[PDB]
Amino acid sequence: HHLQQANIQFRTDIARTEYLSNADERLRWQASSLPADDLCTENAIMLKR
Amino acid sequence: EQQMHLNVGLRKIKETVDQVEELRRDLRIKSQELEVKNAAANDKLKKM
Amino acid sequence: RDLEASIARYKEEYAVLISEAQAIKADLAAVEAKVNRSTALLKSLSAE
Amino acid sequence: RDLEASIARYKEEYAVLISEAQAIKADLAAVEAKVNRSTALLKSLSAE
Amino acid sequence: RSDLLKLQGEFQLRLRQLEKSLLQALNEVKGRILDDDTIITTLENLKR
Numbered sequence: 442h443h444l445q446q447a448n449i450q451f452r453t454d455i456a457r458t459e460y461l462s463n464a465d466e467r468l469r470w471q472a473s474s475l476p477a478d479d480l481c482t483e484n485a486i487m488l489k490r
Numbered sequence: 491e492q493q494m495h496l497n498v499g500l501r502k503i504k505e506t507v508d509q510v511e512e513l514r515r516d517l518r519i520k521s522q523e524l525e526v527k528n529a530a531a532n533d534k535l536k537k538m
Numbered sequence: 539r540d541l542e543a544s545i546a547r548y549k550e551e552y553a554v555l556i557s558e559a560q561a562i563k564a565d566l567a568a569v570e571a572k573v574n575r576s577t578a579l580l581k582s583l584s585a586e
Numbered sequence: 587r588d589l590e591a592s593i594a595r596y597k598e599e600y601a602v603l604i605s606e607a608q609a610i611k612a613d614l615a616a617v618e619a620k621v622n623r624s625t626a627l628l629k630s631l632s633a634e
Numbered sequence: 635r636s637d638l639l640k641l642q643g644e645f646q647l648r649l650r651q652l653e654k655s656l657l658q659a660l661n662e663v664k665g666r667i668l669d670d671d672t673i674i675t676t677l678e679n680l681k682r
Contacts, residue, residue, distance in 0.1 A: 534580055535556075586656070
């Protein structure tokens with residue numbers, strides 16, 4: 442809402458997880474017993490970056 | 491980088507379609523010259 | 539004898555240019571097959 | 587019409603086979619060039 | 635369900651790899667696509 446109010450463009454359609462990681466990284470993550478959850482995927486993204 | 495890759499691919503595809511068109515033209519010219527060669531050949535065969 | 543020598547030379551030369559035409563024909567067939575293969579590849583690449 | 591039909595087969599398959607005869611003549615010339623080049627190389631490699 | 639989740643994961647990986655390979659193959663080709671038939675064969679294999 443702050444960025445919309447400030448006339449700053451950003452993609453709303455794309456979610457955080459696939460924007461911050463590629464499919465190969467995610468697949469390796471479930472290969473590494475990462476639980477299949479959006480929050481767990483975000484946690485893995487933070488643990489990487 | 492993905493934009494440059496896609497531009498390269500599209501350019502290559504357009505070059506390829508232009509090449510196949512000019513190669514159709516070359517094939518037609520080849521057919522015509524082959525036909526005229528064979529015709530003269532058979533004419534002088536009847537001469538022999 | 540003179541007309542028979544005519545036969546010899548001219549007929550040798552004409553069989554020679556006939557083989558030349560047969561060669562240009564194999565080349566033309568290869569070109570046509572290449573054109574067909576390329577067109578198939580290109581109409582397969584429309585989606586990309 | 588019968589004789590001309592017989593000719594309008596025989597003349598050209600014998601033209602085709604004389605064409606392939608000159609094709610194998612070109613093959614034989616290539617083989618001979620390969621042979622003499624190879625023997626020159628071998629006689630130049632005797633000291634080695 | 636577990637088997638087909640694994641199958642779908644492998645399949646999506648394979649589609650990604652094929653698309654990337656096709657892009658890089660079109661990118662790295664030198665000259666024209668039809669100059670060499672290895673590019674044609676690789677593209678046809680990737681399509682199939």
